[PDB]
From a paper:
Cellular assays validated GSK986310C as a candidate SYK (spleen tyrosine kinase) probe and X-ray crystallography uncovered the structural basis for the observed selectivity of the CK2 inhibitor GW869516X. Another potent and selective inhibitor for CK2 was GW869516X (CATDSCK2 of 1; Kdapp of 78 nM; IC50 of 85 nM) representing an imidazotriazine chemotype unrelated to the RO-compound series. The structure clearly shows GW869516X binding in the ATP pocket of CK2α. The central fused ring interacts with the back of the ATP site and the hinge region, stacking between Met163 and Val66. The indole group sits underneath Val53, projecting away from the pocket. The trimethoxybenzene group protrudes from the ATP site interacting with the end of the hinge region and the top of the αD loop. Examination of the structure of ATP site of a number of representative kinases indicated that a number of residues that cluster around Lys68 are highly conserved across a large number of kinases, whereas residues in the hinge region and around the top of the αD loop are less conserved. GW869516X does not interact with the highly conserved Lys68 or its surrounding residues. CK2 target engagement by GW869516X in cells, was confirmed by NanoBRET assays resulting in IC50 values of 446 and 319 nM for CK2A1 and CK2A2, respectively. GW869516X was less potent in NanoBRET versus Kinobead assays likely because cells contain far higher ATP concentrations than lysates and the plasma membrane of the cell also constitutes a physical barrier.
CK2 is involved in the regulation of many cellular processes including cell growth, proliferation and death. The protein is often overexpressed in cancer cells and some become addicted to CK2 activity. As a result, CK2 has emerged as an interesting target in oncology but very few molecules (for example, CX-4945) have made it to clinical trials so far. Our Kinobeads profiling data contained 64 CK2 binders some of which showed very high affinity and selectivity.
Residue numbers in the entry: 3 to 329
The structure:
Amino acid sequence: GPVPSRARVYTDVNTHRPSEYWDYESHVVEWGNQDDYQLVRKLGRGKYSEVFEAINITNNEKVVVKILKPVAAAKIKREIKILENLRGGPNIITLADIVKDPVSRTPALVFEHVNNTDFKQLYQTLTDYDIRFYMYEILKALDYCHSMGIMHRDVKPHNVMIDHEHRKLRLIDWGLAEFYHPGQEYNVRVASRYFKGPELLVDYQMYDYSLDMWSLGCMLASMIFRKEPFFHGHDNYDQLVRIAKVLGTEDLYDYIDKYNIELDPRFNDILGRHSRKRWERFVHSENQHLVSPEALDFLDKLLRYDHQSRLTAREAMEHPYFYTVVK
Ligand SMILES: COc1cc(Nc2ncc3c(C)nc(-c4cc5ccccc5[nH]4)n3n2)cc(OC)c1OC
């Protein structure tokens, strides 16, 4: 069967913590007053919640209320524990309150509001310096949560709020986040298609923090090459084929061989034989100002099939690509 795997960093952080830290099922939720918040407008809705802009009438501050649909109402304790564990952390969204929605009768998480610029619009105007600055800000969040024994598992542009005016960034939507425990087999049905790591696409369940570093690599590829998303698969099978057309099939077979993974037999007719592409193939007159040797070296160290070979968030922050960013 598959060869086991463990994170190369923050491996045992949860076992050295009291069970109260990671045993989210035993958590007793402290409830606030729903009357403190007046709903203003619906911002969106996913398959697990409805999101509203609201006003906290006790301080007139703008907030965001995530009302859980009963499908996620079930595993709310996990999200709440993770948000309370990470509160105050660099660039982590602040959970301000937990109230019971009087209409859905489900939990409603109250968060700080970010004056976000739609990523589709914002990514088009980002400069080489802005990409490096924002990537460093995301890394602070990722290294903090990883150091706290938590995997985000849904890193993507939609979950990175950017107030471009104040150059402020928050990592949001911790609904898929999980505590990392060495040797645990996790659900591969996490992240969004374009940012799923090869470990999810090949059904390797013993993954870790490094999954978020593949997702970050995809975001960086989209920003520097001005192609969003960079890997545009039609489904989870074609997603891996899109990856293999860039990284090659030989490194993919070496990765499955190393972990003793049996590739789904449907891949035999669609995968083909591809060699790795040099990153300059993706450079053209329209994105050349965002591409540098440091950017390509950094991307190359994030977009690796072998999750154990990817840069850690702390290692990524030490990379030369961030030397020009003011610290
Ligand atoms: C002022 O305009 C905005 C403000 C915000 N603010 C924001 N601040 C915090 C926060 C949190 C914790 N969750 C969401 C959020 C917004 C949203 C929209 C659709 C689906 C899920 C969503 N989640 N947000 N959104 C978001 C916006 O678009 C995503 C946005 O429109 C561009």
